[PDB]
A paper describes a structure:
Crystals of the complex were obtained in space group I121 when combining the p73 DBD with the ankyrin repeat and SH3 domains (residues 891–1128) of human ASPP2. The six p73 chains in the asymmetric unit were traceable between residues 114 and 311. Overall, the p73–ASPP2 structure is highly conserved with the p53 complex but exhibits a shift in the ASPP2 position to better accommodate the variant p73 L2 loop. As a result, the contact surface area of the p53–ASPP2 structure (753 Å2) is slightly greater than that of the p73–ASPP2 complex, which varies across the noncrystallographic‐symmetry‐related molecules from 672 to 742 Å2. The binding of both proteins is directed primarily by the L3 loop interaction with the ASPP2 SH3 domain but supported by further L2 loop contact with the fourth ankyrin repeat. The most significant contact is made by the cancer hotspot residue p53 R248 and the equivalent p73 residue R268, which was disordered in the unbound p73 structure. Both side chains undergo rearrangements to fill the large SH3 pocket formed between the RT and n-Src loops. Comparison of the two structures reveals that the n-Src loop in the p73 complex is moved ~ 6 Å away from its position in the equivalent p53 structure. To avoid a steric clash with p73 L199–R201, the fourth ankyrin repeat of ASPP2 is moved by ~2Å relative to the p53 complex and there is an ~180° change in the Ψ-angle of ASPP2 Y1023. Although the binding mode of p73 is similar to that of the p53–ASPP2 complex, we show that it requires additional structural rearrangements in ASPP2 to avoid steric clashes with the H1 helix, which bulges out from p73 due to its L2 loop insertion.
Residue numbers in the entry:
A (entry chain B): 920 to 1121
B (entry chain A): 114 to 318
Write the structure that this text describes.
């Protein structure tokens, strides 16, 4: 079993160990810092799970994929939530995190991953469920597209990553996952799960 | 090649009907004869009745295939949305592949077909006569994704095609109808029927 020391392998192991100085150096040598290992884990997943906030802030501000899903669908927001780390959750949300992204096996969002028996539960879960409940209502209904969207029906809006639009109606009773939005002059339905309260960092 | 949906009673006068479906908002399924449209809740039992005038030949089967209704969508295979496909719920210990939209409930002889040429998914059951002193053969169906499922049907309407076939695939009968998998069948039926009677100047009450 050969231990790999290539630039991506180093960035990942460094992010897990908490070697900020090494992380700041090895990142410019890696072709794509958002690229994962064989289990779908990226440097950000490692930074978040191991609780290295300084690396979390660095990687995210660098432009690393904030919504990277491991083999089981876990994104950095699911990982921050499982740690009941409201501060990292708030930061990731402000950095374009997909609030409605679900894990594959169970169809659980980040808010569901919070640990009841661990400290900081109430504050972390109430913050994440709050964003899920207030998105498209708060900040004058302003949300951002975190992915491109090609319409399948006439009453649907095309979206481009980063697109800023206003939510006219959520219709939480009839088709919970589809929201009536306004982008530029046009109006249509958009999928809620592709949307964020804040856009991605380019 | 697009799957054909044209009604074909054929030599055995093949009929597809639905027992008195509750007009109630509580109903898990309802069938609209006026619109030839079935409204169903995700993963709930929907009993469909089959009738024939004379028994069909030995080895006769009944296939159920979903197809997109609109011409601009018809070449796309009707499959389950990625999310419900990867989910544990209704996928643990099932005979049905996790990607199939239509399931048959309570029949060990059902077959889940994935055509290697067309990519079309369907489910086939052998033809069985009605019970002694009964008029119909009941097949229990389940629709495993909502019409609104992003990545799957993605709000696009569909047709359900029921075809009575020979063992070699030759068509003996065919009946199709629109399918709608929603949270409120009863409410959605009433709304659609009211709009249709108004638009088509149909005399009512």
């Amino acid at each position: 079993m050969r231990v790999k020391f290539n630039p991506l392998a180093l960035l990942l192991d460094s992010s897990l160990e908490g070697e900020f100085d090494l992380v700041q150096r090895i990142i410019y040598e890696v072709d794509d810092p958002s690229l994962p290992n064989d289990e779908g884990i990226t440097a950000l997943h490692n930074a978040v799970c191991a609780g290295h906030t300084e690396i979390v802030k660095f990687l995210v501000q660098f432009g690393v994929n904030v919504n990277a899903a491991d083999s089981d669908g876990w994104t950095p927001l699911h990982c921050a939530a499982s740690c009941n780390n409201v501060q990292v959750c708030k930061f990731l949300v402000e950095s374009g995190a997909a609030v409605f992204a679900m894990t594959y096996s169970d169809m659980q969002t980040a808010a569901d991953k919070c640990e009841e028996m661990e400290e900081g539960y109430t504050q972390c879960s109430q913050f994440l469920y709050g964003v899920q409940e207030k998105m498209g209502i708060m900040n004058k209904g302003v949300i951002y597209a975190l992915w491109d969207y090609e319409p399948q029906n006439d009453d649907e809006l095309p979206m481009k990553e980063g697109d800023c639009m206003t939510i006219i109606h959520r219709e939480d009773e009839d088709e919970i996952e589809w929201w009536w939005a306004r982008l530029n002059d046009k109006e249509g339905y958009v999928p809620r799960n592709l949307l964020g309260l804040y856009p991605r960092i380019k | 090649v697009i799957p054909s949906n044209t009604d074909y009673p054929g030599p055995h006068h093949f009929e597809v009907t639905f027992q008195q479906s509750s007009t109630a908002k509580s109903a898990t399924w309802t069938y609209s004869p006026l619109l030839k449209k079935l409204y169903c809740q995700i993963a709930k039992t929907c009993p469909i009745q089959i009738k024939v005038s004379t028994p069909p030949p030995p080895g006769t089967a009944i296939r159920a295939m979903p197809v997109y209704k609109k011409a601009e969508h018809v070449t796309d295979v009707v499959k389950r949305c990625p999310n419900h496909e990867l989910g544990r719920d209704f996928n643990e210990g099932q005979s049905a592949p996790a990607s199939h939209l239509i399931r048959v409930e309570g029949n060990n002889l059902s077959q889940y077909v994935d055509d290697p040429v067309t990519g079309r998914q369907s489910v086939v059951v052998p033809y069985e006569p009605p019970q002694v002193g009964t008029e119909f053969t009941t097949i229990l169906y389940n629709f495993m994704c909502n019409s609104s499922c992003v990545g799957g049907m993605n709000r696009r309407p569909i047709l359900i095609i029921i075809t009575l076939e020979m063992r070699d695939g030759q068509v003996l009968g065919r009946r199709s109808f629109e399918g709608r998998i929603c949270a409120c069948p009863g409410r959605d039926r009433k709304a659609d029927e009211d709009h249709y009677r108004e638009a088509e100047n149909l005399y009512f009450q």
